Design a protein around this motif. Structure first.
Motif, PDB file in Angstrom:
ATOM      1  N   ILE A 132       1.796  12.898  -0.212  1.00 15.42           N
ATOM      2  CA  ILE A 132       1.060  11.644  -0.340  1.00 15.42           C
ATOM      3  C   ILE A 132       1.964  10.441  -0.075  1.00 15.42           C
ATOM      4  O   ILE A 132       1.620   9.551   0.713  1.00 15.42           O
ATOM      5  N   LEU A 133       3.124  10.377  -0.744  1.00 14.94           N
ATOM      6  CA  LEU A 133       3.957   9.184  -0.608  1.00 14.94           C
ATOM      7  C   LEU A 133       4.464   9.018   0.818  1.00 14.94           C
ATOM      8  O   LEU A 133       4.509   7.895   1.336  1.00 14.94           O
ATOM      9  N   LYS A 134       4.817  10.125   1.489  1.00 15.11           N
ATOM     10  CA  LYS A 134       5.230  10.027   2.887  1.00 15.11           C
ATOM     11  C   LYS A 134       4.072   9.548   3.776  1.00 15.11           C
ATOM     12  O   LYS A 134       4.247   8.680   4.637  1.00 15.11           O
ATOM     13  N   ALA A 135       2.872  10.099   3.576  1.00 14.65           N
ATOM     14  CA  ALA A 135       1.745   9.703   4.417  1.00 14.65           C
ATOM     15  C   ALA A 135       1.382   8.239   4.205  1.00 14.65           C
ATOM     16  O   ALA A 135       1.157   7.498   5.171  1.00 14.65           O
ATOM     17  N   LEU A 136       1.353   7.795   2.946  1.00 11.67           N
ATOM     18  CA  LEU A 136       1.083   6.390   2.683  1.00 11.67           C
ATOM     19  C   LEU A 136       2.184   5.514   3.262  1.00 11.67           C
ATOM     20  O   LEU A 136       1.905   4.433   3.794  1.00 11.67           O
ATOM     21  N   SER A 137       3.439   5.977   3.218  1.00 13.96           N
ATOM     22  CA  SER A 137       4.517   5.190   3.812  1.00 13.96           C
ATOM     23  C   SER A 137       4.319   5.021   5.318  1.00 13.96           C
ATOM     24  O   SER A 137       4.624   3.963   5.876  1.00 13.96           O
ATOM     25  N   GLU A 138       3.813   6.050   6.001  1.00 13.38           N
ATOM     26  CA  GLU A 138       3.564   5.885   7.429  1.00 13.38           C
ATOM     27  C   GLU A 138       2.507   4.822   7.689  1.00 13.38           C
ATOM     28  O   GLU A 138       2.534   4.166   8.737  1.00 13.38           O
ATOM     29  N   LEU A 139       1.587   4.620   6.740  1.00 13.45           N
ATOM     30  CA  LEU A 139       0.597   3.550   6.810  1.00 13.45           C
ATOM     31  C   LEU A 139       1.119   2.224   6.261  1.00 13.45           C
ATOM     32  O   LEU A 139       0.352   1.262   6.161  1.00 13.45           O
ATOM     33  N   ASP A 140       2.401   2.154   5.889  1.00 13.18           N
ATOM     34  CA  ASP A 140       2.996   0.956   5.277  1.00 13.18           C
ATOM     35  C   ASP A 140       2.334   0.606   3.941  1.00 13.18           C
ATOM     36  O   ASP A 140       2.210  -0.569   3.572  1.00 13.18           O
ATOM     37  N   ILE A 141       1.907   1.619   3.199  1.00 10.90           N
ATOM     38  CA  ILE A 141       1.331   1.451   1.868  1.00 10.90           C
ATOM     39  C   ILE A 141       2.277   2.069   0.850  1.00 10.90           C
ATOM     40  O   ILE A 141       2.696   3.225   1.000  1.00 10.90           O
ATOM     41  N   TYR A 142       2.567   1.320  -0.215  1.00 12.02           N
ATOM     42  CA  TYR A 142       3.403   1.821  -1.306  1.00 12.02           C
ATOM     43  C   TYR A 142       2.653   1.606  -2.614  1.00 12.02           C
ATOM     44  O   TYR A 142       2.338   0.448  -2.970  1.00 12.02           O
ATOM     45  N   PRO A 143       2.167   2.565  -3.218  1.00  9.97           N
ATOM     46  CA  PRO A 143       1.496   2.545  -4.493  1.00  9.97           C
ATOM     47  C   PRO A 143       2.381   1.966  -5.562  1.00  9.97           C
ATOM     48  O   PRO A 143       3.587   2.192  -5.571  1.00  9.97           O
ATOM     49  N   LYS A 144       1.777   1.228  -6.469  1.00 10.48           N
ATOM     50  CA  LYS A 144       2.486   0.631  -7.586  1.00 10.48           C
ATOM     51  C   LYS A 144       2.691   1.627  -8.688  1.00 10.48           C
ATOM     52  O   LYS A 144       3.711   1.619  -9.381  1.00 10.48           O
ATOM     53  N   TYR A 145       1.694   2.493  -8.908  1.00 12.06           N
ATOM     54  CA  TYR A 145       1.781   3.422 -10.068  1.00 12.06           C
ATOM     55  C   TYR A 145       1.038   4.733  -9.792  1.00 12.06           C
ATOM     56  O   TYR A 145      -0.142   4.682  -9.399  1.00 12.06           O
ATOM     57  N   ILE A 146       1.711   5.871  -9.997  1.00  9.94           N
ATOM     58  CA  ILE A 146       1.050   7.202  -9.837  1.00  9.94           C
ATOM     59  C   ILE A 146       1.162   7.945 -11.174  1.00  9.94           C
ATOM     60  O   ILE A 146       2.290   8.043 -11.696  1.00  9.94           O
ATOM     61  N   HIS A 182      -7.785  13.874   3.369  1.00 12.11           N
ATOM     62  CA  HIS A 182      -6.788  14.891   3.067  1.00 12.11           C
ATOM     63  C   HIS A 182      -6.933  15.514   1.690  1.00 12.11           C
ATOM     64  O   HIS A 182      -6.335  16.568   1.444  1.00 12.11           O
ATOM     65  N   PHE A 183      -7.709  14.910   0.797  1.00 13.52           N
ATOM     66  CA  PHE A 183      -7.882  15.402  -0.556  1.00 13.52           C
ATOM     67  C   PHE A 183      -9.357  15.264  -0.899  1.00 13.52           C
ATOM     68  O   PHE A 183     -10.186  14.947  -0.037  1.00 13.52           O
ATOM     69  N   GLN A 184      -9.703  15.520  -2.150  1.00 18.58           N
ATOM     70  CA  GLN A 184     -11.054  15.268  -2.632  1.00 18.58           C
ATOM     71  C   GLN A 184     -10.998  14.092  -3.591  1.00 18.58           C
ATOM     72  O   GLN A 184     -10.298  14.151  -4.612  1.00 18.58           O
ATOM     73  N   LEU A 185     -11.700  13.018  -3.256  1.00 12.42           N
ATOM     74  CA  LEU A 185     -11.793  11.890  -4.172  1.00 12.42           C
ATOM     75  C   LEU A 185     -12.805  12.221  -5.256  1.00 12.42           C
ATOM     76  O   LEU A 185     -13.985  12.467  -4.970  1.00 12.42           O
ATOM     77  N   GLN A 186     -12.328  12.255  -6.496  1.00 11.69           N
ATOM     78  CA  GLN A 186     -13.165  12.471  -7.668  1.00 11.69           C
ATOM     79  C   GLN A 186     -13.714  11.167  -8.219  1.00 11.69           C
ATOM     80  O   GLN A 186     -14.774  11.165  -8.849  1.00 11.69           O
ATOM     81  N   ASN A 187     -13.006  10.061  -8.006  1.00 14.73           N
ATOM     82  CA  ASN A 187     -13.467   8.758  -8.458  1.00 14.73           C
ATOM     83  C   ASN A 187     -12.745   7.666  -7.680  1.00 14.73           C
ATOM     84  O   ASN A 187     -11.618   7.853  -7.209  1.00 14.73           O
ATOM     85  N   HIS A 237      -5.036  -4.492  -3.780  1.00 13.51           N
ATOM     86  CA  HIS A 237      -6.414  -4.586  -3.308  1.00 13.51           C
ATOM     87  C   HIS A 237      -6.488  -4.519  -1.792  1.00 13.51           C
ATOM     88  O   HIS A 237      -7.393  -3.879  -1.236  1.00 13.51           O
ATOM     89  N   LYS A 238      -5.545  -5.170  -1.103  1.00 17.04           N
ATOM     90  CA  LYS A 238      -5.588  -5.227   0.357  1.00 17.04           C
ATOM     91  C   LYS A 238      -5.332  -3.870   0.997  1.00 17.04           C
ATOM     92  O   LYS A 238      -5.708  -3.671   2.156  1.00 17.04           O
ATOM     93  N   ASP A 239      -4.709  -2.940   0.271  1.00 18.10           N
ATOM     94  CA  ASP A 239      -4.413  -1.588   0.737  1.00 18.10           C
ATOM     95  C   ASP A 239      -5.488  -0.576   0.361  1.00 18.10           C
ATOM     96  O   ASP A 239      -5.390   0.587   0.773  1.00 18.10           O
ATOM     97  N   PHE A 240      -6.489  -0.971  -0.430  1.00 18.65           N
ATOM     98  CA  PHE A 240      -7.360   0.016  -1.066  1.00 18.65           C
ATOM     99  C   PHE A 240      -8.163   0.832  -0.059  1.00 18.65           C
ATOM    100  O   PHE A 240      -8.217   2.065  -0.153  1.00 18.65           O
ATOM    101  N   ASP A 241      -8.844   0.156   0.871  1.00 18.36           N
ATOM    102  CA  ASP A 241      -9.725   0.844   1.815  1.00 18.36           C
ATOM    103  C   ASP A 241      -8.952   1.858   2.653  1.00 18.36           C
ATOM    104  O   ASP A 241      -9.410   2.986   2.852  1.00 18.36           O
ATOM    105  N   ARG A 242      -7.752   1.491   3.117  1.00 11.26           N
ATOM    106  CA  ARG A 242      -6.968   2.418   3.929  1.00 11.26           C
ATOM    107  C   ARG A 242      -6.390   3.560   3.097  1.00 11.26           C
ATOM    108  O   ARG A 242      -6.266   4.686   3.601  1.00 11.26           O
ATOM    109  N   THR A 243      -6.032   3.294   1.833  1.00 15.91           N
ATOM    110  CA  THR A 243      -5.656   4.379   0.931  1.00 15.91           C
ATOM    111  C   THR A 243      -6.834   5.312   0.660  1.00 15.91           C
ATOM    112  O   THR A 243      -6.658   6.531   0.618  1.00 15.91           O
ATOM    113  N   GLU A 244      -8.032   4.752   0.440  1.00 15.36           N
ATOM    114  CA  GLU A 244      -9.217   5.587   0.233  1.00 15.36           C
ATOM    115  C   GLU A 244      -9.511   6.453   1.458  1.00 15.36           C
ATOM    116  O   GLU A 244      -9.863   7.632   1.325  1.00 15.36           O
ATOM    117  N   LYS A 245      -9.373   5.881   2.657  1.00 12.56           N
ATOM    118  CA  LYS A 245      -9.551   6.648   3.886  1.00 12.56           C
ATOM    119  C   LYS A 245      -8.585   7.821   3.932  1.00 12.56           C
ATOM    120  O   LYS A 245      -8.982   8.959   4.224  1.00 12.56           O
TER     121      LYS A 245
END
Ligand code: AGS
Ligand code: AGS
Ligand code: MG
Ligand code: MG
Lengths: 251, 290, 290, 251
Positions: free
Chosen positions: C256-270, C232-237, C219-227
């Protein structure tokens, strides 16, 4: 056990069943009938302006020739059908079956020979009913059966063994025809030429290929004791070899 | 149906080498291997189409063995139905109309069963051929790629039908086949054949699934990813040719993805899914060519 | 290679009925349908093995068509290599040694190429047969279940090889095949033939709106992941409550994973869920029998 | 264009290439050589206790007979090879190719005939080198080539058409043999019997099957103007029919 015997016979029944359904069989019968009727009608009753009296023996021999050839081809088809369709692979899975396969085909060959002999009989009876002349002895027709059984079984088993040896079908039909039409061709072409001509000619009496083929156009026959034995012995050994071979040949 | 020390070669080419086989109270045994390994050869030895196998083939000849090897064998100028009747009478015990019908309609070949075989498609011929084998009401059924030419639905219905039958009749079934997904539908074990002998005996009693997670990396990252995953999780299998590493399933990818990023490794792909015979196969055989 | 209004029947059995076909600048066209629908028939009409199709088959006869229909066609008492040379000289332009070698080693048939065909397994024969067709260096290649008897690896390597070749040579490939999973490897479209007419076309390069890659974060990463995904992509939902973001399907997660890593974000599930040709197939054909 | 012609010839080359590699070819050659040498050695130089002088013409005719039969079988194999292996399906994809297929086979038949004629020539030259007698005219050997070309091409194309009509191979080999060995069998068996005997016999001079088969054992030949034309005309029409047929027959 009878269960084994039953399965063997069921295969025989199918091969004969096929013979009686294909239109080709019916065509071949009509062709023979036509040819015999033709000889009777065109000249047997007219060449010398006889009072419509014919020699059934001439007809008899011609009919035999034709039916033995057609018969042999029926025998070859019976033999090669499983190689042709590849269905042989579904039979040769164990010794009991492999042996039964040979037995079944042997029986089918015998029954084919009987059928052809019966056709021969009928065609000639019709001819006898149709015109004048002294009817042929019943016993002559019976001996003719014996000739058919021996001729066809000898060639059948021989060709069967070859079929199994090579696993080819084109060359079985070829040999059937070739052997039948070569003996009467070659005899008068060159037998008389060598210093051994007489030796060679006499030798043919002890060679089933030669004497069985030659008698195909005879009005009668009488096998010498040797000739009789040699032919029958040849049939027995081919039968044995077919069994020994099928039991070992990978499919 | 037991095989003891079977050895078979074609000239210098050894196909089978001291290979043993049995049914350990199992009913459906799949056979898996690469093309050229000898699956057909094994089946032919069991069927008895080979008598030069230098070994012991233990068959109670009292029993019937039904089989289908390579391309289907049928009489081309006869109907499908004709062939079924013939074989039932000839190789089988007799023609059982009810049995025959169940197979025909279960397979769904009914609309063309009375047409001549030469007019059949490859698929149709296989459906019929399977039925032909079944018509012997055999105990041992040996099938060489039985669904090789079947469509998706044909395969499922045929395989399902056979499984029902193995209980109706006390059968043992050997299926050699590609389409591991079909083996996975109907099986209770599978054996992997390589270099003339069995390499794995894979038993499957239940759809346990043994859920796994696939992590996929660039080939240049494979060695270090394998090292990381094998040290910190349980490595189950690999597919070096495609860069896959298979570990025990993880609910949450964070720990793995963070640790891999610290090694400068970023997966091309990651997913949690069920275990498969396909993965088992590749792990075993991929190195031949790759 | 165009088909206009093709109609073909066997007696009362209509197989094709006013069927049209073309390559809409596509290169790899898959053909899917149930057994008995007529896939081979279509291919034979195109190959020109049928001259009674009541319609127009538009072929510039200047071009070569290579093909493989039903079981492989080879000269049994000759070597594999012999067959390749013969066909290259006979049906093709001439024997191209380098071309031939690339195919042989790519397929991996090398170890048995000098052996007689009658000694080949079914699988081996198919690998060779595909190569035989390719030896014509054709523009149109028509394959009837080309991987029908291939093992998992054989299929992948052969199909991959062909795709490479369609660029080397200006080719158009028609593949009729079960194993939708193989079509999915090499395709850019597929056509579904049912009831004697084409029913549904699929453009593989378009896919559908629902084909989405779902990213799940804390949850704490959501807004920055959405940004990041918005930029860089089209958010469909966007499901902030549950931590999910949906974008169009991604084949490769590295960017995606490299860009999120630069933001110190690691997704739990893709995860990505896209419908398979298999699902498409069943939707269309399952009702025939079911 | 020459590209088309080239592809056609490449197929021809392979069929001939095969002939020269199979051990069966070599065996057949040795058999013919042996038989000819045998006749020369056993009696030609000894039957009448001559001073080792022989009739090359007797040898010549015998060699021809044997080579024409072997040749015809080579022709049949050339014809049926693609039906047998099923490879025909890979050729008949378009009219240009379908026609080229017929052309290629026609060329192969001609080349086979030439090969057999060359063998014949060589065998006889060896015989002439070996013993005494007046050597045969070169021009006689040449006419013998013409006979081979015509005989084999006639039968070849005829059988080819049948092969394509039925898509069977077993019966092509069977007909090849059957036709060759039936004419000389049947003539003396029944031609003389009907009131139309003379009519029938004369009729054979206008029937290629009969006259071409009969001349297989002649030491020489001279075709009548009609007989010559009829045979050649028959070859041309068969060639035409093969093309028209292949262009339409589904494979
Ligand atoms: N008649 C034969 N002569 C020589 N070698 C053979 C023969 N039959 C099979 N082989 C070889 O035996 C090996 C195994 O053959 P198979 O039993 O047909 O293979 P397989 O495991 O069934 O593979 P598939 O056909 O692709 S499922 C191969 O290397 C073949 O080349
Ligand atoms: N020679 C033939 N005579 C009569 N009917 C035929 C013949 N060949 C094919 N058919 C029928 O034509 C229909 C379609 O045949 P195919 O083109 O072989 O099928 P398919 O779409 O290739 O299916 P597969 O073989 O399972 S991929 C079927 O209903 C066949 O029974
Ligand atoms: Mg196999
Ligand atoms: Mg098909």
């Amino acid at each position: 056990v009878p269960r084994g015997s039953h399965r063997i016979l069921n295969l025989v029944k199918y091969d004969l069943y096929s013979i009686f359904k294909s239109p080709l069989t019916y065509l071949a019968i009509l062709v023979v009938s036509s040819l015999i009727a033709t000889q009777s009608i065109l000249m047997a009753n007219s060449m010398d302006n006889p009072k419509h009296i014919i020699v059934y023996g001439s007809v008899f021999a011609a009919a035999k020739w034709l039916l033995l050839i057609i018969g042999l081809m029926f025998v070859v088809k019976t033999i090669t059908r499983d190689f042709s369709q590849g269905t042989i692979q579904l039979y040769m899975s164990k010794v009991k079956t492999r042996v039964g396969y040979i037995i079944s085909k042997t029986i089918s060959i015998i029954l084919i020979s009987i059928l052809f002999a019966l056709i021969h009989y009928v065609i000639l009876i019709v001819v006898q009913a149709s015109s004048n002349g002294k009817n042929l002895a019943f016993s002559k027709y019976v001996d003719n059966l014996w000739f058919f059984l021996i001729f066809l079984l000898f060639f059948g088993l021989f060709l069967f063994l070859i079929t199994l040896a090579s696993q080819k079908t084109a060359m079985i039909f070829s040999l059937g025809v070739f052997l039948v039409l070569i003996v009467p061709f070659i005899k008068p072409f060159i037998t008389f030429i060598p210093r051994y001509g007489e030796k060679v000619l006499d030798a043919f009496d002890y060679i089933p290929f030669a004497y069985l083929t030659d008698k195909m156009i005879s009005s009668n026959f009488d096998f010498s004791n040797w000739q009789w034995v040699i032919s029958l012995g040849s049939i027995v050994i081919f039968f044995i070899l077919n069994i020994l071979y099928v039991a070992k040949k990978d499919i | 149906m037991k095989l003891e020390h079977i050895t078979k070669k074609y000239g210098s080419n050894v196909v089978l080498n001291d290979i043993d086989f049995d049914f350990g109270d199992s009913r459906i045994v799949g056979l898996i291997g690469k093309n050229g390994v000898g699956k057909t050869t094994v089946m032919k030895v069991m069927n008895g189409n080979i008598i030069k196998f230098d070994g012991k083939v233990d068959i109670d000849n009292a029993d019937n063995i039904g089989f289908l090897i390579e391309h289907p064998k049928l009489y081309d100028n006869k109907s499908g139905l004709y062939n079924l009747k013939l074989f039932a009478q000839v190789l089988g015990k007799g023609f059982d109309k009810a049995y025959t019908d169940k197979i025909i309609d279960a397979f769904g070949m009914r609309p063309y069963i009375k047409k001549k075989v030469k007019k059949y498609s490859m698929g149709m011929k296989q459906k019929l051929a399977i039925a032909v084998s079944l018509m012997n009401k055999p105990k041992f059924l040996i099938l060489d790629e039985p669904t090789n030419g079947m469509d998706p639905d044909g395969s499922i219905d045929v395989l399902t039908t056979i499984k029902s039958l193995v209980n109706e009749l006390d059968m043992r079934i050997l299926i050699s086949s590609h389409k591991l997904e079909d083996i996975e539908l109907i099986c209770d074990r599978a054996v992997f054949l390589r270099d003339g002998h069995f390499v794995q005996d894979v038993n499957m009693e239940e759809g346990v699934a043994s859920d796994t997670t696939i992590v996929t990396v660039d080939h240049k990252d494979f060695d270090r990813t394998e090292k990381y995953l094998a040290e910190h999780f349980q490595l189950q299998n690999v597919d070096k040719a495609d860069g896959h590493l298979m570990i025990n399933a993880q609910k949450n990818y964070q720990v793995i993805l963070k640790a891999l990023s610290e090694l400068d490794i970023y997966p091309k792909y990651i997913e949690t899914r069920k275990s498969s015979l396909r993965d088992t196969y590749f792990n075993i055989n991929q190195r031949g060519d790759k």
